[PDB]
Ligand SMILES: COc1cccc2[nH]c(C(=O)N[C@@H](CC(C)C)C(=O)N[C@@H](C[C@@H]3CCNC3=O)C(=O)COP(=O)(O)O)cc12
């Protein structure tokens with residue numbers, strides 16, 4: 001089961017940012033509100049010149065609010081695709097936090113927001129083309145993505161920015177870099193084709209083994225350099241490392257190399273059969289996710 | 298694009314507590330000066346059918362331990378109501394949200410806050426199936442994890458407390474009155490659920506989603522009426538369709554009637570024959586109408 005980590009710590013950090021007639025979400029940490037620079041753009045169909053929109057900017061055009069309650073804007077700086085809006089009071093519900101840049105294969109959580117209010121929470125994976133499969137409509141921009149580490153530290157890593165012509169979603173980190181360097185402009189960009197995250201598929205077959213599902217298991221083995229060479233030719237990523245699968249291979253007796261071979265055979269399809277109710281290989285769950293949901297670690 | 302989501306969990310996170318009796322531990326929900334929790338926590342360690350009326354009579358308050366975020370609460374009294382206990386504590390939860398208690402019906406969607414030792418670790422949306430079970434993810438210690446919904450007015454509906462995992466892996470809970478959904482027992486025995494029925498109302502919503510995303514290779518021009526479909530749905534593992542007109546918002550945007558979609562379900566019954574609908578290779582009943590219209594239009 002795909003899960004999101006709980007969002008209360010992040011809910012208190014989501015504000016409403018208004019510039020003229022355009023509204024989106026921002027993230028209030030200390031006395032800074034970070035939001036997509038789309039909010040200062042003019043209503044036009046052309047490509048936006050953001051340097052010019054920044055220069056002709058009026059601080060009194062801003063309206064930043066938390067649950068119907070208005071914060072005073074002190075200043076605004078521009079960093080890549082985001083704005084840093086300094087305000088006259090710090091957020092007293094600021095959680096202990098860091099900023100981290102996601103890597104393809106990472107999982108995290110979206111808190112989907114509209115006019116500064118959370119409406120929904122779900123776990124996503126950052127894909128190898130640096131997009132996610134989320135759900136957003138108009139207004140969602142600035143919805144944050146986060147992870148909660150074991151110590152309680154929240155990692156802020158995503159601010160929603162665009163939905164591509166394909167439907168895949170794209171945002172930036174809090175430095176202002178867009179993931180995959182997509183343009184926060186109204187132009188059709190076509191993302192490159194998604195690879196299966198071989199690490200997640202391996203986690204899922206181990207999950208299959210712990211659930212007593214073994215009809216698919218190959219007796220034979222293929223090693224890492226062999227698998228990765230085959231991966232580059234078949235819409236799959238390289239496998240990370242065998243040692244980091246230790247806790248799942250200990251509990252199962254089945255080495256990673258055995259599942260790599262099983263991925264080559266089952267690549268051709270199942271033949272009407274299931275594997276945990278799925279009819280194709282599952283890209284969806286990482287190893288950490290598999291491990292926390294069967295063992296609580 | 299349909300993504301199974303949970304409603305925000307923050308207001309529920311402040312009501313979760315650790316409830317301990319002797320050495321046994323589970324979770325509960327603290328509202329006002331009451332903590333509700335499964336009565337299993339006062340069971341004795343004995344592999345036979347628990348005598349809950351006797352274990353209640355031998356119960357001793359000082360054996361209870363109830364804490365929020367490590368901060369312990371004093372128990373003042375305990376009463377048993379079906380399969381849950383109501384524990385009175387000597388201070389009120391200041392973060393008690395406006396709330397009611399609702400019993401779910403088959404087909405209802407709601408949200409689980411998966412909890413262990415009084416700390417939330419995960420949140421997800423679920424649908425109550427026709428066999429009064431849910432497909433969730435829980436390990437030992439999760440008992441008492443709450444199920445909830447948030448109404449448009451901001452009222453949290455508390456509706457579920459996790460009790461048991463059946464041999465098949467499906468999950469059963471109780472509501473806050475103490476009733477177990479499906480009249481399952483909260484005993485370490487072997488009970489077997491009935492076969493699950495595909496939720497026809499959600500398959501209709503799902504097929505509407507597919508049309509609004511431009512996936513319509515499956516679409517039937519044939520119409521079958523509600524009566525005809527309900528009769529067919531019996532013999533093939535689907536529920537009846539409740540109504541038609543609640544989809545009118547979608548019928549208008551696609552030009553397709555509900556009767557075409559029910560003919561399409563009979564036509565799509567076996568499988569898709571290689572093709573897919575929104576990447577799904579068989580019919581999908583995860584999303585309700587309300588989910589589809591909200592995620593796609595914000596209503
Ligand atoms: C020719 O043009 C295109 C061609 C092909 C693909 C394209 N894609 C985009 C795009 O995505 N454009 C951003 C605006 C840019 C300037 C950042 C946007 O629309 N973001 C939404 C979130 C979206 C709303 C629907 N689902 C979401 O995820 C906001 O939330 C904020 O914009 P608004 O709130 O509507 O003002 C334009 C475009």
Ligand SMILES: COc1cccc2[nH]c(C(=O)N[C@@H](CC(C)C)C(=O)N[C@@H](C[C@@H]3CCNC3=O)C(=O)COP(=O)(O)O)cc12
Pocket residue numbers: 321322323337435436437438439440441459460461462463464468483484485486487
């Ligand atoms: C032994 O005969 C059986 C035969 C076949 C299937 C069976 N299933 C159950 C059952 O489910 N038993 C309840 C206890 C009582 C109410 C009977 C239980 O195990 N609940 C777990 C959650 C469960 C645990 C794993 N996944 C979950 O969802 C907690 O909530 C924490 O319980 P503990 O921490 O271990 O005290 C007994 C049984």
